[PDB]
Design a binder for this molecule. Structure first.
Ligand code: CLA
Ligand code: CLA
Ligand code: CLA
Ligand code: CLA
Ligand code: CLA
Ligand code: CLA
Ligand code: CLA
Ligand code: CLA
Ligand code: CLA
Ligand SMILES: CC1=C(/C=C/C(C)=C/C=C/C(C)=C/C=C/C=C(C)/C=C/C=C(C)/C=C/C2=C(C)CCCC2(C)C)C(C)(C)CCC1
Ligand code: SF4
Lengths: 122, 51, 51, 51, 670, 98, 86, 250
């Protein structure tokens, strides 16, 4: 009974919290705004920004670890101190990644990696 | 290396084409199935308004 | 859009690697459709462009 | 068949030797069955639902 | 001795196999490491290490099973409504399984008692506890404690035997000793021990509960001290099974105790007989089958057959109190053991193939063509006969000619031997019922039962064809003459000779798993529909019976459309309309997930690894472009692994679909 | 190391060596088995109060090395991530702040 | 019958010859490698097509290539046992 | 003799058990037992414990030794060894102790059927009772297709009569018109149709494969088979009509 009272309170809190959120005039289900509004309830801009930051953080930490451990032995037996060092260092990815992009340290010319299968010779 | 034919230019960077097509396919699949799963789970849990 | 992207992905990959991929860099010497390239080199089921 | 009393004295299999379908033929026949089933299962549903 | 038990190999993954010593150069190394983990035969060192590993791993798994039992016991003592179920089992659904109130998961717990909300368990553990005279929470506490102690003991024994056994160890090879001590001391001397347990703790207790004293004067009467009740207090003469206990709707526990005593006596006498009995004919089997894989296959087949006997005997030979009325429990107890029978039979076939490839086969492999050929013919005959009676009925019913179909009201195929099989049970000419619920009524077997039994026979024969073909054609074949050198599991021998894909015994198991799954899905459906239509259900005071399916089986199961409509559609209304319904939300969700997983398996089943390898290379181009080089090189799954993943996902998704479909419906109806 | 005083002797002198020990334990026969997990099985010549530990030999370094294996690392991180998501859901349910 | 061709990149492994289950391949003397020997396929009429030779070849891309020809199959290239085509 | 097998203490292994081991173990392995063979443990211990060697053991070491030696019951006796040495001899000599499958198993019938045929390497010449027994051979040889001295039309007529007489039943009973007042002329027509269809198939076979085992010398190839098939059609008509006549009259 007490747990159901807590559930009822949660439901009423959800009702009062979604009041400012927009819902269709026929469904009643609140909508998510994906127009880049930045200033409406249920907008997708804030979750997009947060996720993009943390996802770039994850990718940058992984790339940094792979660059600093250029060995297969370091991928099965993780160098945990270096791994956590890269994980902590990944916070500055939006600046470091761009500084590597413009300074020619992220991309590699196509003539240095395997392009793909041959399509001609004769 | 004679990048003259259109098929030649396509084949020069075919890996880029296939990688980006794989990326967009993965994005669409992940974010359609995951949102559908969110809606399914939250509507099975008596919460149509949590979709 | 996901379905169209993946269908185009499979078809475009088959077209672009029909003449040779990294796994089988002689695919244009064989027919458009052929069984496989043997269990060796990792295994090569469904390797032709017809596949 | 080559061990059954009457068959062996009429048909030794040397003419139209029965063999399992080749790999590409097998894939194509399975694809044909799958496509026919998936496509032709729908019109009955359409007619039952709309009419 | 134990100074060599060092952690230095924990960091060195893949140490056990010398093929993995080159290091993880590719991602195939990971899958190979997982694949060879329990393959003690091919791992490094002498044969003594193989025995040590096998025995200690058996002990470790036994400890794991004991830990699972302990968890069930603790859930029953501290996370269950077993008290109110004891007081009133006919009004309370068993539940020793709660869900936390997170993400609204609170909707999964449902009303089982006025003071308890939780997930209705269908394991039948509450009936087992009641049949085990467990009444107070302290008894379950001490059962859990003993099971935890057993877990620790077995874990320590597994740890010790890796160094107690040595190169000279030979106790595992003494098969006479194993058979004799097992038989006598366990099947005989422990069966009588359980008979003692029942005579001294169940009959003092279960009659007290059935006598209406759920009070039992608390411990004044329940805590033994009841030597004035007599062992055969309420046998009521009759014959065991002819007359059920009217209160609990089960066989009297005194008869069960007598059964265990007599079975222990029989096993002890058989152990004594084995000193001089019939031999010298199974002797070639005796000498040629002393190997790990052969005895493993024999034991797997035996245990699976015992599992299917348990599945058929747990439902309409009611032993457990208040269990026949608990229809979801009956359904689960039948179907789970059916699935385990199928899986362990398939494993027996696989290890028969492995033994053929490692050891040396026997005489039956030399006329393998007649064997696996008459098996082919019989499979074709009973497939073109059993199933097509369904196709014939379907076509002629669609044409509007019901008088030309195979039904009871039409051309009828009488189950002659089953109708003359009144030997089993041989009960009196009526039914038994406890409380608005039918305990057991004799299944009147007609035409539909005949056809579905022949479907079962056909599916069993095809699965056996696949298994025996894999076993007999393991060493060599007219197709490939050196399959022995190719090993046990291989993708193929090449695209030559027209194509050699899936000739290995492993691939024969791969197909046999599909066919076993298809075999006992029909068994599950036959049971699930027949019991609802003809056995289970409500009652009327005027001796009239209203079953759950209202007798749909004898009129609809003669056609495939009947199965589609009255079983997979009408009886799926409970699971499909299960959203926001407290008890059955997870079952609807799991139905959806099972469909997803089953369809997901088809990606691995239909595709080859070369396409995925080329796609992975295309992606690896983009990775190398941005200086992201995985030095564990990404490789697509091996052909055998692709098939294994496809089969696992296929069976798991389909089993989950059926699981949800049956359980949600039986929970709603009950 | 662990047998600094055992008077360990070879099979060839099973009945020849008798000098017992710093204790009074009789000499022990060492059999060089070919198993890597049991390279040497020691056999006794009589009653003895020999200290044979049944505990394993583990050390912090290789236990940490095992925990540094990619499975343990990527399982600890994912377990912590899943637990953090569950805790956030418990503390801020129904994302009312959004 | 299939078509088994040997290319100049051969380094005289003899592994392809040893892996062949129907004695299609053989070693011939040559002067294009340090082993002074290259493979040859004088009896491809007995080539079933198992491609074990391709599995055994360690050159960067196979110095021995087997081209399957399904509209060309003979009794030897199919491994016919129950049936004779001669 | 062998050094370690002499004066071995009874406490290590008993005399009868050791003799049983030596009998079971092949003679060539006595000098150097292989490994994982009870004789290997007997050698590895009898060379350490004995009269001139360590005469005592720790209780646990002796306990483990007693569980490495055979327990006098896990070893084959002389008659069992004879059973194996003779069963393998039979199997390798091309003779099979005849056995018949039963309820998940087989009963040995106590018969030695010579298994390999006249061509020992031929797979289809392995002689079995159901195909190479006297009754089976004489039954197959006396069939209409094989009977000596029969003109091709006689074989065709006999086979056709059998087929036509049998084929009426499945249609006149449990047929679409099984309950009609006639219910048998329909079956007659359907049986004649089946006979005609299989006769057309036989004509296709004789004009495509052209078996020449029934042709007399110096004739158009396949003429005997074609005559047999035509007279099978005639005999099928006759047998169908005769079955219908019996059904209607009786
Ligand atoms: C260091 C980690 C890392 C990084 C930086 C990238 C980066 C990239 N991947 Mg990728 N990938 C990774 C790991 C990584 N991947 C792994 C482990 C897999 C196997 C599942 C893949 C499978 C994969 C596919 C199939 C595809 C990409 C693609 C891409 C590109 C587009 C972004 C994308 O699709 O992301 C999405 C990434 C995924 C869906 C994969 C899951 C992400 C993994 C789990 C992250 C692992 C990070 C690692 C644990 C960090 C550990 C750090 C620690 C040791 C210190 C981009 C260059 C796409 C491409 O080529 O388009 C240009 C594409 O189609 N990736
Ligand atoms: C339920 C069935 C099912 C599912 C879920 C998938 C899922 C996928 N397939 Mg697949 N496939 C299937 C059946 C299925 N397949 C069948 C039956 C075939 C016929 C052989 C194929 C043939 C096929 C090809 C030929 C290709 C795919 C590709 C893909 C991927 C598309 C990208 C994407 O959405 O990733 C999102 C991932 C998911 C939705 C999986 C769930 C992940 C967790 C649960 C979240 C994805 C992994 C393409 C690919 O690799 O894209 C990169 C591709 O090239 N599939
Ligand atoms: C091996 C069988 C087994 C299985 C399948 C489970 C399964 C479960 N137990 Mg459990 N348990 C077991 C053995 C088992 N237990 C044993 C042997 C004991 C005695 C030591 C317990 C004591 C126990 C308690 C005391 C509780 C559970 C709870 C739970 C549930 C949630 C677990 C959780 O929060 O994750 C925890 C995950 C981790 C710790 C990660 C590692 C879950 C259904 C909880 C529950 O049902 O809550 C209502 C709960 O409170 N269990
Ligand atoms: C199926 C279970 C099983 C089986 C068949 C055995 C069998 C054996 N154990 Mg064993 N053991 C087990 C479980 C088992 N154990 C468990 C669970 C533990 C943990 C308590 C032990 C702890 C143990 C010790 C400590 C010793 C044995 C020993 C032995 C051997 C002689 C013991 C005897 O007479 O019996 C024998 C091979 C003894 C041995 O190896 O004799 C030399 C010995 O010293 N066992
Ligand atoms: C003489 C004492 C005795 C008694 C009272 C029982 C009583 C029972 N036996 Mg039983 N049994 C006995 C001796 C006995 N057995 C012996 C000596 C053997 C060895 C051959 C068996 C082998 C045996 C098997 C194999 C099975 C039973 C089963 C049963 C139960 C079903 C009874 C029934 O429907 O019978 C109708 C008459 C019942 C509790 C069945 C059971 O457990 O049902 C779940 C079952 O499958 N018994
Ligand atoms: C007593 C039972 C038993 C025992 C002791 C063994 C023992 C063995 N089997 Mg075996 N087997 C069994 C039952 C058993 N099997 C059954 C019932 C089957 C039929 C399915 C098989 C089929 C089988 C095959 C086909 C093969 C073996 C092999 C082996 C050997 C190595 C196994 C290994 O390393 O795998 C390591 C362990 C794993 C990879 C486990 C992974 C988990 C599985 C694959 C998926 C399970 C999914 C799970 C149930 C659902 C997840 C829940 C979901 C909600 C997430 C070993 C001798 C292999 C071999 O080479 O033998 C010499 C081999 O090729 N077995
Ligand atoms: C970074 C992730 C994270 C964070 C911030 C927390 C934080 C918290 N957890 Mg939690 N937990 C986590 C991961 C996490 N946990 C994981 C991965 C599990 C495994 C299932 C658990 C299992 C767990 C249980 C079972 C309980 C908590 C509890 C708690 C709360 C009290 C602190 C505690 O008991 O430590 C948690 C301990 C650990 C994380 C160590 C796990 C080993 C606290 C808010 C307790 C609570 O609610 O307090 C009233 C409680 O009962 N957690
Ligand atoms: C479509 C069905 C069918 C087919 C293919 C044949 C085919 C044939 N019939 Mg036939 N027949 C049929 C139905 C059929 N019959 C029926 C229903 C009747 C009953 C009226 C007959 C009565 C019949 C006669 C009386 C004769 C044939 C003959 C023949 C053969 C010329 C040929 C094999 C002739 C034959 O066998 O001569 C060699 C011949 O004389 N048929
Ligand atoms: C032994 C030779 C024989 C005899 C005694 C009969 C006798 C009869 N036939 Mg008959 N019939 C025969 C051969 C014979 N038939 C053959 C070889 C054919 C195939 C052409 C037929 C085809 C045939 C038809 C189609 C019909 C008869 C019918 C009849 C009945 C008039 C009578 C009982 C008629 C009858 O009474 O049917 C009910 C009828 O309709 N017969
Ligand atoms: C069941 C059984 C069996 C089997 C049997 C059989 C197989 C039978 C068959 C039978 C048969 C199958 C019979 C048949 C018969 C036939 C007949 C008897 C016919 C006759 C015919 C005729 C007589 C004709 C005539 C004619 C002609 C020729 C032409 C013209 C017209 C006329 C009509 C004149 C066994 C032993 C295994 C075992 C158990 C029992
Ligand atoms: S395996 Fe390849 S490289 Fe070696 S000899 Fe044969 S063809 Fe030449």
């Amino acid at each position: 009974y007490a747990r159901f009272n807590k559930k009822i309170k949660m439901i009423e809190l959800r009702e009062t919290a979604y009041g400012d959120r927009l819902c269709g005039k026929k469904d009643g289900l609140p909508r998510t705004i994906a127009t880049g509004e930045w200033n409406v309830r249920g907008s997708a801009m804030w979750p997009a920004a947060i996720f993009l930051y943390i996802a770039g953080w994850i990718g940058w930490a992984g790339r940094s670890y792979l660059i600093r451990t250029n060995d297969a032995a370091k991928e099965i037996n993780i160098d945990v101190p270096l791994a956590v060092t890269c994980m902590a260092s990944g916070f500055s990815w939006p600046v470091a990644a761009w500084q590597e992009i413009v300074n020619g340290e992220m991309a590699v010319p196509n003539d240095q990696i395997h392009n793909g299968g041959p399509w001609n010779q004769s | 290396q004679e990048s003259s034919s259109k098929q030649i230019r396509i084949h020069t960077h075919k890996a880029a084409i296939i990688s980006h097509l794989s990326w967009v396919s993965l994005w669409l699949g992940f974010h359609t199935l995951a949102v559908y799963s969110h809606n399914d789970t939250c509507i099975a849990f008596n919460s149509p308004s949590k979709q | 859009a996901l379905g169209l992207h993946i269908t185009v992905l499979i078809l475009l990959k088959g077209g672009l690697e029909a003449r040779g991929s990294k796994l089988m860099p002689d695919k244009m010497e064989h027919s458009f459709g052929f069984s496989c390239d043997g269990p060796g080199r990792g295994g090569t089921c469904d390797i032709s462009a017809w596949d | 068949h080559l061990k059954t009393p009457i068959l062996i004295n009429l048909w030794n299999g040397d003419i139209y030797t029965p063999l399992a379908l080749s790999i590409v033929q097998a894939r194509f026949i399975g694809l044909v069955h799958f496509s026919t089933g998936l496509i032709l299962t729908y019109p009955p549903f359409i007619i039952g639902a709309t009419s | 001795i134990f100074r060599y038990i060092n952690t230095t190999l924990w960091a060195k993954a893949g140490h056990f196999n010398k093929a993995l010593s080159k290091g993880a150069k590719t991602t195939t190394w990971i899958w190979n490491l997982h694949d060879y983990a329990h393959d003690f035969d091919i791992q490094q060192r002498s044969t003594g290490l193989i025995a040590r590993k096998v025995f200690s791993s058996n002990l470790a798994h036994l400890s794991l099973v004991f830990f699972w039992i302990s968890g069930m016991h603790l859930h029953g003592a501290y996370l269950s409504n077993y008290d109110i179920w004891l007081k009133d089992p006919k009004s309370i659904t068993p539940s020793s399984h709660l869900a936390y109130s997170l993400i609204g998961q609170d909707i999964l717990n449902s009303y089982t008692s006025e003071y308890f909300s939780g997930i209705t368990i269908t394991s039948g553990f509450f009936q087992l506890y009641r049949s085990e005279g467990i009444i107070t929470q302290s008894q379950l506490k001490y059962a859990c404690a003993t099971s935890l102690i057993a877990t620790l003991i077995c874990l320590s024994g597994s740890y010790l035997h890796m160094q107690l056994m040595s190169k000279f160890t030979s106790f595992y090879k003494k098969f006479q000793s194993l058979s004799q001590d097992h038989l006598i001391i366990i099947f005989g001397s422990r069966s009588t021990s359980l008979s003692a347990h029942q005579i001294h703790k169940m009959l003092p207790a279960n009659p007290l509960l059935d006598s209406g004293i759920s009070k039992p004067s608390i411990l004044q009467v329940i805590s033994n001290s009841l030597s004035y009740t007599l062992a055969l207090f309420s046998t009521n003469l009759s014959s065991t099974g002819k007359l059920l206990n009217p209160s609990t709707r089960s066989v009297f526990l005194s008869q069960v105790a007598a059964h265990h005593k007599t079975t222990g006596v029989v096993f002890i006498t058989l152990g004594l007989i084995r000193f001089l009995t019939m031999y010298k004919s199974q002797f070639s089997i005796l000498t040629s089958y002393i190997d790990y894989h052969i005895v493993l296959s024999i034991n797997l087949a035996l245990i699976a057959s015992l599992s299917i006997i348990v599945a058929d005997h747990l439902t309409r030979t009611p032993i457990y109190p208040h269990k026949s009325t608990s229809y979801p429990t009956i359904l689960c107890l039948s179907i789970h053991h059916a699935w385990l029978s199928g899986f362990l039979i398939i494993g027996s076939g696989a290890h028969a193939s492995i033994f053929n490839l490692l050891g040396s086969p026997t005489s039956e492999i030399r006329h393998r063509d007649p064997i696996y050929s008459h098996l082919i013919w019989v499979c074709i005959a009973i497939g073109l006969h059993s199933f097509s009676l369904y196709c014939h009925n379907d076509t002629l019913e669609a044409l509007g000619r019901p008088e030309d179909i195979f039904h009871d009201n039409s051309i009828q195929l009488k189950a002659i031997f089953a109708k003359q099989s009144f030997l089993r049970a041989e009960l009196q000419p009526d039914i038994e019922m406890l409380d608005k619920k039918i305990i057991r009524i004799t299944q009147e077997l007609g035409t539909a039962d005949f056809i579905v039994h022949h479907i079962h026979a056909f599916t069993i024969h095809v699965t056996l064809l696949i298994l025996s073909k894999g076993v007999l054609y393991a060493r060599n074949s007219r197709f490939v003459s050196d399959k022995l050198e190719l090993g046990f599991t291989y993708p193929c021998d090449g695209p030559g000779r027209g194509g050699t894909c899936q000739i290995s015994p492993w691939d024969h198991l791969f197909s046999a798993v599909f066919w076993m799954y298809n075999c006992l899905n029909v068994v599950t459906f036959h049971y699930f529909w027949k019991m609802q239509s003809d056995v289970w259900g409500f009652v009327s005071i005027q001796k009239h019976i209203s079953h759950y399916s209202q007798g749909d089986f004898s009129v609809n199961s003669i056609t495939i459309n009947g199965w589609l409509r009255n079983l997979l559609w009408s009886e799926a209304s409970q699971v499909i309309q299960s959203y926001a319904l407290s008890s059955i939300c997870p079952y609807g969700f799991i139905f959806l997930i099972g469909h997803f997983i089953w369809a997901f398996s088809l990606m691995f089943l239909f595709s080859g690894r070369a396409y995925w390898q080329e796609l992975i290379e295309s992606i690896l181009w983009s990775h190398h472009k941005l200086k992201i080089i995985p030095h564990i090189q990404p490789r697509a799954l091996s052909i055998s692994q692709g098939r294994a993943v496809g089969f696992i996902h296929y069976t798991l998704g389909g089993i989950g679909s059926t699981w949800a479909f049956i359980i949600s419906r039986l929970l709603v109806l009950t | 190391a662990e047998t600094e005083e055992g008077l360990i002797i070879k099979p060839e002198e099973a009945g020849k060596i008798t000098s017992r020990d710093k204790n009074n334990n009789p000499p022990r026969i060492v059999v060089k088995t070919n198993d890597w997990d049991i390279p040497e099985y020691q056999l006794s010549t009589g009653a003895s109060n020999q200290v044979s530990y049944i505990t394993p030999v583990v050390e912090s370094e290789d236990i940490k090395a095992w925990l540094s294996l990619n499975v343990n690392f990527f399982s600890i991180i994912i377990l912590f991530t899943v637990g953090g998501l569950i805790e956030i859901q418990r503390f801020f349910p129904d994302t009312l702040y959004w | 019958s299939h078509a088994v061709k040997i290319y100049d990149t051969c380094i005289g492994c003899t592994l392809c010859v040893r892996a062949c289950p129907t004695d299609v391949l053989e070693m011939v003397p040559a002067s294009i490698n340090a082993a002074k020997q290259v493979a040859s396929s004088p009896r491809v009429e007995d080539c079933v097509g198992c491609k074990r030779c391709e599995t055994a070849c360690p050159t960067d891309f196979l110095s021995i290539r087997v081209y399957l020809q399904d509209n060309e199959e003979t009794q030897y290239s199919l491994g016919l046992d129950l049936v004779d085509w001669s | 003799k062998i050094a370690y097998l002499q004066d071995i203490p009874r406490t290590i292994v008993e005399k009868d058990a050791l003799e049983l081991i030596l009998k079971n173990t092949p003679k060539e392995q006595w000098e150097n037992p292989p490994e994982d063979s009870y004789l290997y443990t007997v050698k590895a211990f009898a060379e350490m414990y004995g009269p001139g060697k360590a005469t005592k053991m720790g209780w646990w070491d002796y306990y483990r030794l007693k569980m490495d030696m055979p327990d006098t019951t896990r070893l084959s006796s002389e008659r069992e060894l004879q059973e194996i040495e003779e069963y393998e001899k039979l199997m390798m000599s091309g003779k099979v102790p005849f056995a018949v499958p039963g309820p998940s198993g087989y009963f040995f019938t106590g018969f030695v059927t010579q298994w390999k045929g006249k061509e020992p390497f031929a797979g289809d010449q392995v002689i079995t009772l159901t195909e190479n027994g006297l009754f089976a051979k004489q039954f197959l040889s006396a069939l209409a297709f094989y009977r000596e001295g029969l003109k091709p039309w006689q074989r065709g007529l006999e086979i056709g009569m059998a087929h036509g007489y049998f084929l009426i039943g499945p249609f006149t009973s449990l047929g679409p018109l099984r309950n009609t007042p006639e219910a048998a002329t329909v079956g007659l027509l359907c049986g004649c149709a089946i006979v005609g269809i299989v006769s057309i198939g036989g004509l296709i076979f004789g004009s495509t494969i052209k078996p020449t085992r029934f042709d007399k010398d110096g004739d158009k190839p396949g003429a005997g088979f074609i005559e047999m098939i035509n007279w099978h059609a005639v005999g099928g008509l006759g047998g169908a009509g005769f079955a219908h006549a019996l059904i209607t009259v009786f």
